[PDB]
Design a protein around this ligand. Structure first.
Ligand SMILES: O=C(O)C(=O)/C=C/OC(=O)c1cccs1
Ligand SMILES: [Mg+2]
Ligand SMILES: [Mg+2]
Ligand SMILES: [Mg+2]
Length: 714
């Protein structure tokens, strides 16, 4: 082969070279000792990794059997819980405790604000995300539907002053609401000056300062005609840029050019569900971008530097110019042929990611080319997705411990952001947090995966409600509150993030600004956004809502019961007309085809995908988990027939084809369906859905993408 032999391992040359030539230099880790470490960590932890996966299977088979042996229609909750407890699904709740995680940066312990997630394989998107710490509110408002495109205010190819004035007014109101003047409104400001370390705002008839002078954080330029004024509210910065000579500032009563918001406080660079990586070449592309980010030298145009300000008293200071970076590794399930053992068996990808993303993150703890890019406190921040229960969390912590030894890092350098996105984690959440009590930096409700797991776990119980109905079911509302309750009780306030899920509708920003405010109102110190634009707009919510106060008020409250968590989303009798069935079938077949065709044919794992009604959605692979499981569930219980499925797939394929008309590399699925690997992948996900472990889509998706790549090689 072309592989490199290290003990029992056979490592793809492209990976071996990348690590030796690019990742290792500058870390002071002995290369041979690194590789011996890899061989040993893989040998030592692989058995437990497999035992945990087998345990998921044993539990699911027992639950499957429990539903099948019973006829009683209304589920008996006392019996169901007793059962789950007996088999070891539902574990006892540990005594109260406080997390001890230390050496964590302020962006995580203290600051409440948006968290942006992007595919690590797209260098330009990663770079924009890293730079998304600051973003223009005017661009965010003018460019989206937050300012309605009513008659007269529609966007054209050139600047619409009517629309621009609405942008300015929206922003002035935000200022009054966030950093109130002692008297009057920012709407009537004519200028800004700094006198005796105090901000002075000129009104037409008078002058005034801030109602709370402490919100004045600094300025740039001369105190008597500053070029910008820096404010702070709820720990987040706001910067008013002053330039009468700008095309917007010329129209403005105070010569204001823009309002800049501190937006994406943190960013998660994603190796999991938003990317498609199925071999050594794909992993290396990902690792190389992550390396470029940590070394500060990624260029696709470059990483931003820190921002210089004058303090109110007159001294100099600096604020970070970049989003603090997490990396999301893959979870415990999949293997990847980047490394195989002597028998030819692939190595667990989660173990590999911990070794390589962790090695690479060392560069972010030291000076670039510039000061160090990432954690000044010395932490490496890893998001670990798709864990099922406390023993899997413990396994991840032990993995991190062993990697830390290989890398010569102090124990607990590698912190864990826990995804609460599987049912067995949800109902044992307190124990999961406890298992990582000295490493945990967040918990986050990954509601898409969680919905997928909800369907698969109770697959045998009966037909589930429609996909759109899931977001409002009792189980999910309880799941969201239970998550917050568990974090706060474990002492997360002031120590770790309590996070909520992704807003997926990229073009519906008026809707986002209107509804996503629910999340910090529910005590979430962060929530996910898919773009820098959405980060800037979501930042508005944290100025409107005092998350610290909200969390304080929620303390000690127990707002969800175990019974509510366990309420299966079974459809009621006679729930749907025949037309409603068909629309749901088409909805899910279109969602599957729309996502799968980009994944299999182009190796794209997140993008703006039009849904059946042409709404642009940007969802990771979990959306595929939901739709394929729901259709498998309906097929399993006689709601629809295999002919209904095939008919819908055949109906939706040409539509998806049309939706991709603006794409040079696209190739249509219709009408030669059986010649399209993507179409066959979509079909396989549905018809084999019930048989996939926990409904996971990766085994089929990865195989099909590999098949596609191999065909393209001929
Ligand atoms: O809910 C889940 O299962 C989860 O992992 C978070 C979902 O995020 C996404 O949809 C993304 C869209 C773009 C980047 S991530
Ligand atoms: Mg997920
Ligand atoms: Mg329904
Ligand atoms: Mg306030």
């Amino acid at each position: 082969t072309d592989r490199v032999s290290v003990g029992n391992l056979r490592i793809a040359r492209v990976l071996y070279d990348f690590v030796n030539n690019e990742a290792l230099p500058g870390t002071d880790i002995d290369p041979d000792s690194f590789w011996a470490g890899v061989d040993k960590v893989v040998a030592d932890l692989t058995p437990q990794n497999q035992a945990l996966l087998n345990a998921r299977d044993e539990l699911q088979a027992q639950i499957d059997k429990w539903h099948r042996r019973r006829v009683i229609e209304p589920i008996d909750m006392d019996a169901y819980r007793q059962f789950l407890t007996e088999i070891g699904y539902l574990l006892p709740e540990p005594d109260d405790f406080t997390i001890t995680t230390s050496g964590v940066d302020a962006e995580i312990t203290t600051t409440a604000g948006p968290q942006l997630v992007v595919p690590v394989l797209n260098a330009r998107f990663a770079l924009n995300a890293a730079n998304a710490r600051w973003g223009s509110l005017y661009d965010a408002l003018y460019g989206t539907d937050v300012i309605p495109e009513t008659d007269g205010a529609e966007k054209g190819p050139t600047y619409n002053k009517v629309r621009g004035d609405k942008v300015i007014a929206y922003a002035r109101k935000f200022l009054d609401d966030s950093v109130p003047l002692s008297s009057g409104s920012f709407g009537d400001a004519t200028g800004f000056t700094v006198q005796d370390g105090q901000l002075v705002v000129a009104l037409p008839d008078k002058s005034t300062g801030l109602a709370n002078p402490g919100q004045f954080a600094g300025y740039t330029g001369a105190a008597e005609s500053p070029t910008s004024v820096l404010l702070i509210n709820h720990g987040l910065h706001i910067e008013i840029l002053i330039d009468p000579e700008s095309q917007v500032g010329t129209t403005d009563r105070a010569g204001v050019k823009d309002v800049i918001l501190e937006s994406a406080i943190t960013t998660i660079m994603d190796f999991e569900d938003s990317v498609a990586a199925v071999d050594a070449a794909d992993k290396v592309l990902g690792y190389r971008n992550w390396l470029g980010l940590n070394k500060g030298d990624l260029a696709a145009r470059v990483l931003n530097r820190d921002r210089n300000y004058t303090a109110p008293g007159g001294g100099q200071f600096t604020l970070p110019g970049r989003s603090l970076m997490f990396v999301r590794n893959v979870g415990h399930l999949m293997t990847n042929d980047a490394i195989v053992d002597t028998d030819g068996s692939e190595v667990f990808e989660g173990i590999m990611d911990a070794l390589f993303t962790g090695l690479i993150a060392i560069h972010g703890l030291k000076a670039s080319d510039g000061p160090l890019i990432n954690s000044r406190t010395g932490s490496i921040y890893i998001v670990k997705p798709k864990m099922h229960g406390p023993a899997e969390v413990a396994f991840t912590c032990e993995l991190f411990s062993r990697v830390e030894d290989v890398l010569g890092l102090p124990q607990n350098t590698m912190k864990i952001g826990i995804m609460d996105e599987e049912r067995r984690t949800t109902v044992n959440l307190k124990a999961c947090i406890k298992a990582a009590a000295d490493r945990v930096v967040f918990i986050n409700t990954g509601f898409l995966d969680r919905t997928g797991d909800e369907i698969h776990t109770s697959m045998e119980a009966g037909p589930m409600v429609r996909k759109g109905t899931m977001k409002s079911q009792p189980w999910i509302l309880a799941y969201e509150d239970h998550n917050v309750d568990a974090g706060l009780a474990a002492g997360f306030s002031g120590r770790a993030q309590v996070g909520k899920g992704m807003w997926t509708m990229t073009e519906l920003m008026a809707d986002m600004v209107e509804t996503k405010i629910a999340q910090p109102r529910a005590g979430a110190s962060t929530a996910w956004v898919p773009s820098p634009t959405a980060a800037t707009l979501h930042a508005l919510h944290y100025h409107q809502v005092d998350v610290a106060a909200v969390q304080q008020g929620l303390a000690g409250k127990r707002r969800a019961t175990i019974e509510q968590l366990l309420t299966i989303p079974l459809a009621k009798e006679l729930a749907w007309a025949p037309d409603e069935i068909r629309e749901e079938v088409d909805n899910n077949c279109q969602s599957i085809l729309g996502y799968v065709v980009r994944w299999v044919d182009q190796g794209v794992g997140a993008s703006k995908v039009p849904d059946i009604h042409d709404v642009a959605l940007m969802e990771d692979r979990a959306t595929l988990r939901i739709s394929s499981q729901l259709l498998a569930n309906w097929l399993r219980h006689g709601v629809i027939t295999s002919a209904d499925v095939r008919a819908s797939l055949e109906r939706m394929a040409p539509l998806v084809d049309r939706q991709n008309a603006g794409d040079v590399a696209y190739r249509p699925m219709a009408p030669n369906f059986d010649d399209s690997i993507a179409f066959l992948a979509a079909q396989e996900l549905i018809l084999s859905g019930a048989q996939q472990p926990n409904g996971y889509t990766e085994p089929i998706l990865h195989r099909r993408r590999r098949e596609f790549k191999a065909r393209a090689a001929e």
